[PDB]
Symmetry: C2
Subunit: 325 residues, 2 copies
């Protein structure tokens, strides 16, 4: 009965969006990058050879009952003075992986124990690192160093590169009503999944339409000076052919104070250029309240609005049409 | 409807027995010592000020489904090369305790999440250490050092000594059909609970009968040369008045090879002296197969037999009697 939406990403963009979509009658599948090597995750991957648990942990938690004892434990973190400030959920994922000898199977077992509504699937079961080639040709190693340089990223890639997707991710892409990429860091959260060759191939094979959710602001070290089309072109480069049908973005202008706050952090609004996009056959979707703005001049997506737009798009794509039989 | 048996102890004696009793129609309450400071537990109590999680963890696990994912995680231990060889269950108890700011409440929440049948209750909610006074008057500090000396223990005591029992332990003692002490290390596993003054007072107040399950062999550093009556007298000393009604033990003689194996480990069978016990008003209970003996000449309790004896005693104590109205 329910519609199937597949989210591809990583980070708080994905976990916040997944929780927002939980408010609608849709079966959510999230395909989540396992390449990070910093913070919580880096602490555990130094200890043991395991794919990154952190982004996946947050997405599992987003699809579960946040008030539950088990979700509270899963999202608990020790202070730096206890157990090296580990995430207890990451430790549980690690233990589960030692038990199953299989990260993907550990994620399946834990998802069931946490009684989530949806599914969360690693982009790959393999232990990988994300690397970048800079515009000048410099190679940067590890997800943590990629934005902490100061050059244009030309491309990102995985080491080892020969890695396979999970069967369940491919099946979800094949059978989706709608596939959503982003919002999140373009290279480290979104494209990092597309670096898994079988995921990119599935995207091109499937007739499910693909939506990109644009970032509000450019991201220092990943997307400096990118307009919306440049973000899409980076996706296209990785995948091999154009494939995005829809983009959610706002072409609103921001107050002097907002622009100032983001200039100080070396960040500007992502420019839309809606005519260029329509010429490329990409449909632009917006709403007047897509973006929320704090009293301190920070901006973010309004989760309720973004979620509803996604659900309403899936609904429209699955609706009756006009033809004569 | 079901009968209520309360077990007081700590260690593998208790966890094995609790699991054995799970085979019968009885509501099990286990009151478990929280004073240990060695191994798994010591690793966590060095990190954080928390009562000992380890004995309690094992008893919770004994009352749960061992094949379950959650019980498997709870009983998982990292190798020494990962997370300092911590018990994942201990880490979860620690995190839960940080969340609730209350060890007893953390144990209640975790018991429910693990879907146990029964209840497990700490002897106290306070952080304590177990100390011993030796026969010569030497004071030894911490549960780990107590057997690792080489003198008769005169008594054990808690630091701080002013600690309170949990309300649920007291209620269970008041309403029990039968209360079982042991099997386990006499001082460090059994008497350590009785050092909580309110537990000893409840034992004397209640009309529920009390059973002591004797150790098969004397324990080096705790009960060298103790016959059964000396074990009971140590309990009596702590509590203040005689209170044991029944004792389960075997007065079988062992093969030369068994005696040899235990002599090498400075250990002999605990002598019964059944006439002395009957003169003290203590009823002795045995069975021909109470003790199992390995091909390598080790001995242990037959769990099935011991469990059934306990259940059958509760049954007899709750049965109809003869009177004229």
């Amino acid at each position: 009965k329910q519609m199937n939406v597949v989210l591809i990403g990583g980070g708080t963009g994905l976990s916040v969006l997944a929780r927002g979509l939980r408010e609608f009658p849709i079966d959510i599948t999230a395909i989540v990058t396992v390449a990070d090597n910093g913070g919580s995750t880096g602490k555990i991957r130094d200890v043991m050879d395991i794919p990154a648990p952190g982004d996946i942990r947050n997405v599992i938690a987003a699809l579960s009952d946040s008030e539950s004892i088990l979700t509270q434990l899963f999202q608990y973190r020790f202070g730096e003075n206890q157990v090296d400030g580990h995430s207890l959920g990451n430790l549980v994922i690690a233990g589960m992986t030692n038990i199953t000898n299989d990260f993907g199977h550990a994620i399946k077992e834990l998802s069931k124990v946490l009684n989530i509504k949806g599914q969360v699937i690693p982009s790959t079961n393999a232990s990988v690192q994300l690397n970048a080639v800079m515009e000048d040709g410099e190679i940067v190693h590890g997800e943590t160093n990629i934005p902490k340089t100061h050059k244009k990223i030309d491309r990102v890639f995985l080491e080892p590169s020969d890695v396979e997707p999970m069967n369940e991710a491919i099946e979800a892409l094949e059978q989706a009503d709608l596939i959503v990429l982003g919002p999140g860091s373009l290279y480290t959260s979104v494209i990092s999944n597309l670096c898994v060759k079988g995921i990119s191939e599935a995207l091109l094979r499937t007739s499910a339409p693909k939506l990109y959710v644009s970032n509000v602001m450019t991201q220092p070290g990943e997307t400096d000076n990118y307009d919306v089309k440049e973000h899409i072109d980076a996706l296209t480069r990785q995948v091999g052919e154009p494939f995005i049908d829809f983009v959610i973005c706002s072409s609103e202008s921001y107050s002097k104070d907002v622009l100032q706050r983001y200039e100080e952090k070396n960040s500007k609004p992502v420019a839309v250029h809606k005519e260029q996009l329509k010429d490329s056959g990409i449909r632009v979707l917006t709403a007047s309240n897509l973006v929320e703005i704090s009293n301190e001049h920070y901006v973010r997506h309004n989760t309720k609005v973004l979620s509803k737009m996604i659900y309403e798009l899936a609904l429209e794509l699955t609706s009756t049409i006009r033809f004569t039989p």
